[PDB]
């Protein structure tokens, strides 16, 4: 048996985006009518805050470049000056059948798949997964950089089912911690309605609302589109931000990888926190790449080792290879 | 059924700014040859034979219909699907590495 | 070339995936060759059991939604696609390129013969109007009208009687029974006066069709080359190339009773004017000129200036 | 002439690219290509196998995937219409579409690499001593390259279109049909290619943009197109029809086409004053174009008299019944708007530049409409042109500002005429 | 019998492009003046996550990739954070006239063809064609991955006479199941109303409003329009999206693939769903073209056994025959 020449997988635990509105702290409970955090524009000029070849370091140039000033446009969202929140909120849709491919090829190499998949759910559960997905959604994760620095972060959590609620999760993002994956009893509750909704047997809709006691005026992170410059003398505006209409709002992707950020068994370390779950498991904000294909703690490698020739690996990389089979992608060459 | 696939002699030439394929797909009615464009990779090296958007899928159609079975084959048929095409270009494939 | 006795109306078609490829060298606008098939294929499909016949047609072109895309910042558009299923051996397709746009447009029909007074106008309007619902346009086919209700009917006049003001009249309903529509009638006058102003270099058609839809720039006697109207180049019919054969003659016809020539398409002019230009609205008519033995098929707008 | 040149180039390319990876295995078909391709034998071996194409130039490969038919390559015909042109004024005839075998690369550069004041391929037709004469040519085998090679432009055989090669009717007036079965005109589409080369880039046009950089331009008519359309044939792989793998690479465009609204307005009309301060006159993109054309070119001379009351009337009265078919046709977006705040526009553009009303009234208000003329809106119209746009005014005795002065009173009147029966 | 070098046939089955517009729940019976959803842009950072090449998968270049990601500009429409469902509304017209080609050569062909065609009708009408059309308007077919993980799908066909509706449909979508079959009375009048149009009787006119209780502002997924990217500079924008004016529409082919999924007797395995009806008869995600020439159950094979050599094929079989006549297509050599 070989495998398939295209494979796919449909993303599972499908994000929104993110609406940012700021109102005052002890009018969080009726947090509906808070207007909208918007992206505005302010005009900054630098310095030089470079490195130098050691080829332009002298001082005429350094006079000519300081003297000669890089000016440009910069737009910046800051909260309303006269409220000290940040409610952000997405809704998150949680699909489940999660082993199903979208497009392969083989009929054997399908069946083959399909049947491990269904070997490691009738063996465990998804609740090791569901836990973990409870971790990252109880603490305040998917805030970025609106989470360092802050008072206080609640986060309420929604089971929507019909038009309306069905049950409410008040969470605490701070005495829950960022590197440990404690248990407590109502994250096994939101880690049971994950898990029963993640292997086919409901449909769950969850909404999040997360507040974030920052200060009486001060500077939000959205979620930073990109732009190119053009052809343009001194250059233009160079941090464009998110935004959905008249809303600073964080991308649903960035959401998307700040819940799955689940894998504390890479093989470099326990000692440097949990990673995003990715085939070749990498991290940009720190560069290096774990989980190196010459070693054999791959995903490609672990999957065609699990799945060809059952060689099956340690239950712990088996958990692995299902956090990146359900945040879905493209597979096969 | 078909022919015993004896594809032989599979050359390589460069003739034009492009590059073919050539080869002698002799069976026990008849022998012809087939010239069949070559996609490189993206260094220099022999990496696939123009599966689709080929040129006897448009150039050498009768010519590959002369040498197999065009006795059973109903009239709403393209006569390159009967023809059995896939094994044949992907023995012309491998017998270039 | 017969003049109508009536103008039939067909006030909103909204086509959706129309063929907006019409040539080897425009792509805009689905070729008027087509509006007038579909004219002749409406009076084969309606002019048999109502004793009429059906030449004329009008174009407005109320809005045109194109479907193209800009590659990688470039000042060209491709065309987007769709696919196509498998082969035998499920691979990929051999994926051809064929545009493809979104139209509304009405049609001013002219209805030349003697069925009008045996029937009554919205009969006959509505009757044709049931038959034109049902009937792809220029490779698309045409959206029905859902509860917005208002352009409902079909109107019809009648050219034989009437006076002058109340031709006018009836001018003044239709003209504004089409308000934002631009009209579309092909130019061999100013072409030719395109003609014998460059004749002094060449009298090759080619280059002037190339030199006229143009944002042209010279140098001190800035500068672009204006003009009243909007221009197009559009196909203007067919210029047979082969001798016309003998229907059993040439293999793999459409059908063995009808003769076959081989064609390069001709090329002419065209414009863009309002409808409240031009005062007669006979003049906004697509009849097309044939001839067997000049193999020269032409789609011309007569009667205008 | 042609004794040397084309056998000694043979030889050069069967040497150059010849031995790249030569070793005894490979010299033992080297030495043998070389041997034949250095003078002589290279030119029969080459004919020998060259009648798979035929030099066709309304050609018929790229109107179908794989259509086999008839690629028929003839002349297209006389004119013999007033205001036509196309591929039968060709002329410098470009009819090098010789397309067939994809495997005759050989033979096409063969047929067209002898340029020197003719063709190669066409060079050699008849007459075939001024091709082996100066080489020494046979009489049997020579004879037989020369009949193999010049008789390259033969028929295919068969009158045979093909099915799904767009074979659509016609209808005569009065009698039957005549189906025409349209090819792909591809010789015109080199031509014009290489026309719009030449216009996209090349060394006219791009030193003519350099010259239109420091402001120092010569005497000389560039042009570019906005809005072309890439039409690309054959897929990842446009040699499996011939010429279209150099000439224009599979990648055909296709020039004008557009509509008058080809890029798609859209209508907003709010009742302020940032909608009152042009709400009453009709300001758009194409009235503002229209406004900058003739401001840009209206306050000149009228001593070109015969260039001047055809263009700048035209220009006057066309922009004016243009900004009002699109004032017209952009106004009426809403289906309900009535006597409100802001509506000082409404009394000038209640009925002209508004859409029908409301129908919840009084039956007895068809007159505060049906009588409200293009007096009020059109010439308020006419006075916002003649305050904006002026005539001369060192010559205000002339006959230009008045041949202008009645085509503002024409197009107010006319604004007026057709903007007045809002009710009626 | 001699037979006929070209074939052309009609479409009937024809759907349009298919609007969408997102309002709330238990106001859809008000459903005319929902806003429309809108393609917005966004821009989003991939990693590497492809299957490296056999060698060369050494941790230098790939943390040196890495740190080199790669830029892209993918744009997704979304519902806005007010609504709750996506009314997509498409108009579908049936032509009749099903079995009289439109193109072909050979006059005693045709009348074969014709005699074959009537020989059917007179003998079972279009019934079963008839029902599953209906089936496949019942369930939400059309909504392709909209219709994965909803609350509840509702579709309401009205048939248009003249201007305005003669029978409204109130359907559910999901109590009507996606790979079976069964008899209704409802959905079988909507069966006998197409086939009634396909007897030839005339144009017949309906129009299809399906809802889904996707999201408080979830993802939609519209077609996507395919740049064909001939090599390099077809541009950094990935995915764009179909949109008819100032809307996210779905393409009016991807409507009529959804709905013609009839054949059910290809017959490698009929657990493997439904396929949708083509000559060799494909299905363009599993790669494998079903219905080979190998066997007897191809539709060039089938057509000239069964209208030439006079011997029929069972009744499934001319289901499918006629099924790939009424899609369309052209055919001869």
């Given at each position: 048996?070989?495998?398939?020449?295209?494979?796919?997988?449909?993303?599972?635990?499908?994000?929104?985006?993110?609406?940012?509105?700021?109102?005052?702290?002890?009018?969080?409970?009726?947090?509906?009518?808070?207007?909208?955090?918007?992206?505005?524009?302010?005009?900054?000029?630098?310095?030089?805050?470079?490195?130098?070849?050691?080829?332009?370091?002298?001082?005429?140039?350094?006079?000519?470049?300081?003297?000669?000033?890089?000016?440009?446009?910069?737009?910046?969202?800051?909260?309303?000056?006269?409220?000290?929140?940040?409610?952000?909120?997405?809704?998150?849709?949680?699909?489940?059948?999660?082993?199903?491919?979208?497009?392969?090829?083989?009929?054997?190499?399908?069946?083959?798949?399909?049947?491990?998949?269904?070997?490691?759910?009738?063996?465990?559960?998804?609740?090791?997964?569901?836990?973990?997905?409870?971790?990252?959604?109880?603490?305040?994760?998917?805030?970025?950089?609106?989470?360092?620095?802050?008072?206080?972060?609640?986060?309420?959590?929604?089971?929507?089912?019909?038009?309306?609620?069905?049950?409410?999760?008040?969470?605490?993002?701070?005495?829950?911690?960022?590197?440990?994956?404690?248990?407590?009893?109502?994250?096994?509750?939101?880690?049971?309605?994950?898990?029963?909704?993640?292997?086919?047997?409901?449909?769950?809709?969850?909404?999040?609302?997360?507040?974030?006691?920052?200060?009486?005026?001060?500077?939000?992170?959205?979620?930073?589109?990109?732009?190119?410059?053009?052809?343009?003398?001194?250059?233009?505006?160079?941090?464009?931000?998110?935004?959905?209409?008249?809303?600073?709002?964080?991308?649903?992707?960035?959401?998307?990888?700040?819940?799955?950020?689940?894998?504390?068994?890479?093989?470099?370390?326990?000692?440097?926190?949990?990673?995003?779950?990715?085939?070749?498991?990498?991290v940009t904000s720190q560069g290096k790449a774990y989980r190196q294909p010459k070693q054999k703690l791959d995903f490609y490698t672990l999957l065609d080792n699990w799945v060809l020739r059952d060689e099956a690996p340690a239950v712990e990389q088996?958990?692995?290879?299902?956090?990146?089979?359900?945040?879905?992608?493209?597979?096969?060459? | 059924?078909?022919?015993?696939?004896?594809?032989?002699?599979?050359?390589?030439?460069?003739?034009?700014?492009?590059?073919?394929?050539?080869?002698?797909?002799?069976?026990?009615?008849?022998?012809?040859?087939?010239?069949?464009?070559?996609?490189?990779?993206?260094?220099?090296?022999?990496?696939?034979?123009?599966?689709?958007?080929?040129?006897?899928?448009?150039?050498?159609?009768?010519?590959?219909?002369?040498?197999?079975?065009?006795?059973?084959?109903?009239?709403?048929?393209?006569?390159?699907?009967?023809?059995?095409?896939?094994?044949?270009?992907?023995?012309?494939?491998?017998?270039?590495? | 070339?017969?003049?109508?006795?009536?103008?039939?109306?067909?006030?909103?078609?909204?086509?959706?995936?129309?063929?907006?490829?019409?040539?080897?060298?425009?792509?805009?606008?689905?070729?008027?060759?087509?509006?007038?098939?579909?004219?002749?294929?409406?009076?084969?499909?309606?002019?048999?059991?109502?004793?009429?016949?059906?030449?004329?047609?009008?174009?407005?072109?109320?809005?045109?939604?194109?479907?193209?895309?800009?590659?990688?910042?470039?000042?060209?558009?491709?065309?987007?696609?769709?696919?196509?299923?498998?082969?035998?051996?499920?691979?990929?397709?051999?994926?051809?390129?064929?545009?493809?746009?979104?139209?509304?447009?009405?049609?001013?029909?002219?209805?030349?013969?003697?069925?009008?007074?045996?029937?009554?106008?919205?009969?006959?309007?509505?009757?044709?109007?049931?038959?034109?619902?049902?009937?792809?346009?220029?490779?698309?086919?045409?959206?029905?009208?859902?509860?917005?209700?208002?352009?409902?009917?079909?109107?019809?006049?009648?050219?034989?009687?009437?006076?002058?003001?109340?031709?006018?009249?009836?001018?003044?309903?239709?003209?504004?029974?089409?308000?934002?529509?631009?009209?579309?009638?092909?130019?061999?006058?100013?072409?030719?006066?395109?003609?014998?102003?460059?004749?002094?270099?060449?009298?090759?058609?080619?280059?002037?069709?190339?030199?006229?839809?143009?944002?042209?720039?010279?140098?001190?006697?800035?500068?672009?080359?204006?003009?009243?109207?909007?221009?197009?180049?559009?196909?203007?019919?067919?210029?047979?190339?082969?001798?016309?054969?003998?229907?059993?003659?040439?293999?793999?016809?459409?059908?063995?009773?009808?003769?076959?020539?081989?064609?390069?398409?001709?090329?002419?002019?065209?414009?863009?004017?309002?409808?409240?230009?031009?005062?007669?609205?006979?003049?906004?008519?697509?009849?097309?000129?044939?001839?067997?033995?000049?193999?020269?098929?032409?789609?011309?707008?007569?009667?205008?200036? | 002439?042609?004794?040397?040149?084309?056998?000694?180039?043979?030889?050069?390319?069967?040497?150059?690219?010849?031995?790249?990876?030569?070793?005894?295995?490979?010299?033992?078909?080297?030495?043998?290509?070389?041997?034949?391709?250095?003078?002589?034998?290279?030119?029969?071996?080459?004919?020998?196998?060259?009648?798979?194409?035929?030099?066709?130039?309304?050609?018929?490969?790229?109107?179908?995937?794989?259509?086999?038919?008839?690629?028929?390559?003839?002349?297209?015909?006389?004119?013999?219409?007033?205001?036509?042109?196309?591929?039968?004024?060709?002329?410098?005839?470009?009819?090098?579409?010789?397309?067939?075998?994809?495997?005759?690369?050989?033979?096409?550069?063969?047929?067209?690499?002898?340029?020197?004041?003719?063709?190669?391929?066409?060079?050699?037709?008849?007459?075939?001593?001024?091709?082996?004469?100066?080489?020494?040519?046979?009489?049997?085998?020579?004879?037989?390259?020369?009949?193999?090679?010049?008789?390259?432009?033969?028929?295919?055989?068969?009158?045979?279109?093909?099915?799904?090669?767009?074979?659509?009717?016609?209808?005569?007036?009065?009698?039957?049909?005549?189906?025409?079965?349209?090819?792909?005109?591809?010789?015109?589409?080199?031509?014009?290619?290489?026309?719009?080369?030449?216009?996209?880039?090349?060394?006219?046009?791009?030193?003519?943009?350099?010259?239109?950089?420091?402001?120092?331009?010569?005497?000389?008519?560039?042009?570019?197109?906005?809005?072309?359309?890439?039409?690309?044939?054959?897929?990842?792989?446009?040699?499996?029809?011939?010429?279209?793998?150099?000439?224009?690479?599979?990648?055909?465009?296709?020039?004008?086409?557009?509509?008058?609204?080809?890029?798609?307005?859209?209508?907003?009309?709010?009742?302020?004053?940032?909608?009152?301060?042009?709400?009453?006159?009709?300001?758009?993109?194409?009235?503002?174009?229209?406004?900058?054309?003739?401001?840009?070119?209206?306050?000149?001379?009228?001593?070109?008299?015969?260039?001047?009351?055809?263009?700048?009337?035209?220009?006057?009265?066309?922009?004016?019944?243009?900004?009002?078919?699109?004032?017209?046709?952009?106004?009426?977006?809403?289906?309900?708007?009535?006597?409100?705040?802001?509506?000082?526009?409404?009394?000038?553009?209640?009925?002209?530049?508004?859409?029908?009303?409301?129908?919840?009234?009084?039956?007895?208000?068809?007159?505060?409409?049906?009588?409200?003329?293009?007096?009020?809106?059109?010439?308020?119209?006419?006075?916002?042109?003649?305050?904006?746009?002026?005539?001369?005014?060192?010559?205000?005795?002339?006959?230009?500002?008045?041949?202008?002065?009645?085509?503002?009173?024409?197009?107010?009147?006319?604004?007026?005429?057709?903007?007045?029966?809002?009710?009626?």
């Open positions: 048996l070989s495998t398939a020449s295209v494979l796919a997988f449909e993303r599972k635990l499908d994000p929104s985006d993110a609406l940012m509105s700021a109102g005052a702290w002890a009018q969080r409970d009726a947090s509906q009518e808070w207007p909208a955090v918007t992206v505005r524009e302010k005009s900054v000029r630098g310095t030089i805050s470079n490195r130098l070849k050691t080829k332009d370091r002298d001082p005429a140039k350094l006079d000519a470049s300081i003297q000669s000033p890089n000016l440009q446009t910069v737009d910046v969202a800051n909260l309303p000056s006269d409220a000290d929140t940040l409610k952000v909120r997405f809704t998150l849709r949680v699909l489940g059948g999660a082993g199903t491919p979208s497009a392969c090829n083989d009929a054997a190499y399908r069946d083959k798949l399909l049947q491990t998949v269904a070997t490691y759910v009738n063996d465990q559960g998804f609740a090791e997964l569901a836990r973990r997905y409870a971790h990252n959604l109880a603490n305040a994760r998917f805030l970025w950089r609106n989470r360092v620095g802050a008072e206080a972060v609640e986060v309420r959590i929604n089971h929507i089912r019909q038009g309306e609620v069905a049950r409410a999760w008040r969470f605490d993002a701070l005495a829950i911690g960022l590197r440990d994956f404690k248990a407590d009893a109502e994250l096994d509750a939101l880690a049971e309605l994950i898990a029963s909704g993640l292997s086919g047997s409901g449909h769950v809709l969850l909404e999040v609302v997360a507040f974030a006691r920052i200060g009486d005026g001060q500077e939000v992170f959205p979620s930073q589109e990109l732009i190119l410059d053009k052809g343009d003398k001194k250059g233009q505006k160079s941090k464009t931000l998110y935004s959905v209409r008249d809303a600073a709002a964080i991308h649903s992707q960035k959401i998307g990888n700040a819940l799955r950020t689940i894998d504390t068994w890479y093989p470099d370390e326990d000692g440097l926190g949990p990673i995003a779950v990715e085939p070749y498991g990498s088996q958990h692995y290879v299902i956090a990146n089979l359900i945040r879905g992608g493209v597979f096969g060459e | 059924s078909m022919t015993t696939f004896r594809i032989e002699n599979v050359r390589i030439e460069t003739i034009n700014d492009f590059d073919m394929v050539k080869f002698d797909l002799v069976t026990d009615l008849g022998r012809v040859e087939l010239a069949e464009h070559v996609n490189y990779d993206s260094e220099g090296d022999f990496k696939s034979v123009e599966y689709t958007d080929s040129n006897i899928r448009y150039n050498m159609v009768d010519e590959l219909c002369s040498v197999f079975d065009l006795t059973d084959k109903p009239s709403l048929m393209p006569a390159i699907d009967y023809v059995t095409f896939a094994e044949i270009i992907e023995a012309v494939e491998e017998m270039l590495e | 070339v017969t003049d109508p006795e009536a103008l039939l109306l067909l006030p909103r078609l909204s086509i959706q995936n129309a063929n907006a490829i019409s040539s080897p060298l425009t792509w805009g606008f689905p070729s008027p060759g087509a509006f007038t098939g579909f004219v002749h294929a409406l009076q084969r499909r309606v002019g048999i059991s109502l004793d009429i016949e059906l030449d004329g047609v009008g174009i407005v072109c109320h809005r045109f939604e194109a479907q193209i895309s800009q590659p990688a910042g470039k000042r060209t558009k491709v065309f987007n696609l769709t696919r196509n299923p498998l082969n035998r051996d499920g691979s990929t397709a051999a994926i051809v390129e064929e545009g493809r746009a979104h139209l509304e447009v009405s049609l001013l029909l002219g209805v030349h013969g003697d069925g009008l007074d045996d029937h009554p106008a919205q009969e006959i309007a509505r009757q044709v109007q049931e038959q034109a619902g049902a009937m792809r346009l220029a490779g698309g086919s045409i959206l029905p009208w859902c509860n917005e209700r208002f352009p409902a009917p079909n109107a019809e006049l009648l050219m034989l009687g009437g006076s002058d003001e109340q031709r006018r009249k009836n001018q003044r309903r239709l003209t504004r029974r089409l308000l934002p529509g631009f009209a579309l009638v092909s130019r061999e006058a100013l072409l030719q006066q395109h003609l014998e102003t460059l004749r002094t270099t060449l009298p090759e058609a080619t280059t002037l069709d190339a030199l006229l839809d143009l944002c042209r720039i010279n140098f001190e006697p800035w500068q672009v080359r204006d003009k009243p109207g909007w221009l197009v180049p559009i196909p203007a019919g067919y210029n047979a190339l082969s001798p016309l054969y003998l229907p059993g003659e040439v293999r793999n016809a459409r059908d063995r009773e009808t003769p076959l020539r081989f064609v390069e398409n001709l090329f002419g002019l065209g414009e863009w004017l309002s409808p409240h230009r031009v005062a007669a609205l006979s003049d906004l008519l697509w009849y097309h000129h044939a001839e067997p033995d000049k193999g020269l098929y032409r789609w011309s707008t007569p009667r205008f200036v | 002439q042609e004794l040397r040149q084309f056998i000694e180039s043979f030889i050069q390319e069967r040497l150059q690219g010849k031995l790249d990876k030569l070793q005894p295995d490979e010299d033992d078909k080297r030495q043998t290509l070389l041997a034949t391709h250095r003078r002589e034998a290279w030119l029969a071996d080459a004919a020998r196998r060259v009648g798979q194409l035929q030099l066709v130039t309304h050609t018929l490969k790229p109107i179908h995937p794989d259509a086999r038919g008839s690629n028929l390559h003839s002349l297209p015909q006389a004119p013999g219409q007033p205001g036509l042109a196309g591929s039968h004024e060709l002329g410098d005839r470009l009819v090098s579409d010789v397309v067939g075998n994809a495997a005759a690369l050989d033979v096409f550069k063969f047929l067209s690499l002898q340029y020197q004041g003719k063709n190669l391929l066409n060079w050699l037709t008849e007459d075939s001593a001024e091709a082996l004469q100066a080489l020494s040519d046979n009489a049997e085998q020579a004879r037989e390259w020369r009949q193999a090679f010049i008789g390259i432009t033969t028929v295919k055989g068969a009158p045979a279109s093909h099915s799904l090669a767009k074979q659509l009717y016609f209808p005569l007036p009065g009698s039957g049909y005549h189906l025409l079965a349209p090819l792909f005109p591809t010789s015109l589409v080199h031509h014009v290619h290489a026309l719009l080369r030449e216009a996209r880039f090349g060394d006219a046009a791009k030193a003519a943009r350099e010259a239109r950089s420091r402001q120092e331009s010569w005497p000389h008519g560039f042009s570019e197109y906005p809005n072309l359309a890439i039409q690309k044939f054959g897929g990842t792989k446009p040699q499996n029809i011939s010429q279209l793998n150099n000439e224009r690479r599979g990648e055909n465009w296709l020039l004008p086409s557009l509509p008058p609204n080809w890029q798609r307005q859209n209508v907003n009309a709010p009742m302020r004053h940032s909608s009152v301060f042009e709400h009453d006159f009709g300001r758009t993109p194409e009235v503002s174009r229209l406004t900058r054309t003739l401001q840009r070119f209206l306050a000149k001379t009228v001593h070109n008299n015969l260039a001047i009351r055809q263009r700048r009337a035209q220009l006057v009265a066309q922009i004016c019944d243009e900004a009002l078919q699109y004032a017209a046709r952009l106004r009426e977006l809403e289906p309900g708007w009535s006597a409100t705040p802001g509506c000082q526009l409404h009394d000038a553009e209640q009925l002209w530049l508004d859409p029908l009303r409301a129908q919840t009234d009084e039956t007895f208000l068809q007159r505060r409409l049906r009588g409200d003329w293009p007096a009020e809106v059109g010439n308020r119209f006419a006075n916002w042109l003649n305050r904006a746009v002026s005539s001369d005014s060192q010559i205000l005795g002339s006959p230009e500002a008045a041949q202008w002065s009645q085509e503002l009173s024409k197009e107010l009147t006319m604004f007026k005429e057709i903007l007045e029966d809002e009710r009626d």
